[PDB]
Structure formats: structure tokens, C-alpha cells
Amino acid sequence: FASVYAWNRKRISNCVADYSVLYNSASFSTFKCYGVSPTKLNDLCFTNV
Amino acid sequence: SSTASALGKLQDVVNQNAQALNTLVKQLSSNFGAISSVLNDILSRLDPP
């Protein structure tokens, strides 16, 4: 993992994503979403993640 | 028969009514400070709280 002043950015596009496994995994200390509800992620379609 | 614009009163009454109705229906496209101007989207995006 890169430094905070050199944060690593990656672009994700043209894929089918399953966000449920992110919510299912308990390995994350903080899972905080702001503009959307965490449980509705699989119900939406985006571009340029 | 020849000269036009002799019926200004009725014409401008109709114009006033149409303009008021059009601005009323156009007011539906304002955020008013929320995150979106369409209700179904915000219903489908985030938690009811």
C-alpha cells in the first residue's frame, strides 16, 4: 500500500460487481457509506468507479 | 381582416395563464437543498431514516 501523500488510485469500469461479500466480511473495522445505503449497492448501476 | 394584434387583451390573458402554469410545472426540477430532484431515485438509493 502506498503512502498517504501518494495515495494509490485505481479505476474500475465494465464489470459486474457483487458488493454483498464486502458487507458479509467482518475483516473491516469501519464500513461507512455516505451517499447510499450499504445494503442497496447490488441494486444500482454506476460508471467509472 | 388585415390588421393583426387588435385582440391584445384576450391574447395576453391566455399568455399569462400559460406562463404561470409552465413555471409551476417547471418548479418540479429543483433540488431545494436535497440530493436529487427525482423522488424515486432517492427512495431507491438510501435508508428511509
UniProtKB/Swiss-Prot annotation, chain A:
Result of altering residue 25 to L: In strain: Omicron/BA.1
Consequence recorded when altering residue 30 to A: In strain: Omicron/BA.2, Omicron/BA.2.12.1, Omicron/BA.4, Omicron/BA.5, Omicron/BQ.1.1, Omicron/XBB.1.5, Omicron/EG.5.1
Outcome of swapping residue 29 to F: In strain: Omicron/BA.1, Omicron/BA.2, Omicron/BA.2.12.1, Omicron/BA.2.75, Omicron/BA.4, Omicron/BA.5, Omicron/BQ.1.1, Omicron/XBB.1.5, Omicron/EG.5.1
Function description: Attaches the virion to the cell membrane by interacting with host receptor, initiating the infection. The major receptor is host ACE2. When S2/S2' has been cleaved, binding to the receptor triggers direct fusion at the cell membrane. When S2/S2' has not been cleaved, binding to the receptor results in internalization of the virus by endocytosis using host TFRC and GRM2 and leading to fusion of the virion membrane with the host endosomal membrane. Alternatively, may use NRP1/NRP2 and integrin as entry receptors.
Oligomer status and interactors: Binds to host ACE2. RBD also interacts with the N-linked glycan on 'Asn-90' of ACE2. Cleavage of S generates a polybasic C-terminal sequence on S1 that binds to host Neuropilin-1 (NRP1) and Neuropilin-2 (NRP2) receptors. Interacts with host integrin alpha-5/beta-1 (ITGA5:ITGB1) and with ACE2 in complex with integrin alpha-5/beta-1 (ITGA5:ITGB1). May interact via cytoplasmic c-terminus with M protein. May interact (via N-terminus) with host bilirubin and biliverdin, thereby preventing antibody binding to the SARS-CoV-2 spike NTD via an allosteric mechanism.
Protein name: Spike protein S1
Organism encoding this protein: Severe acute respiratory syndrome coronavirus 2 (2019-nCoV)
Gene this chain is encoded by: S
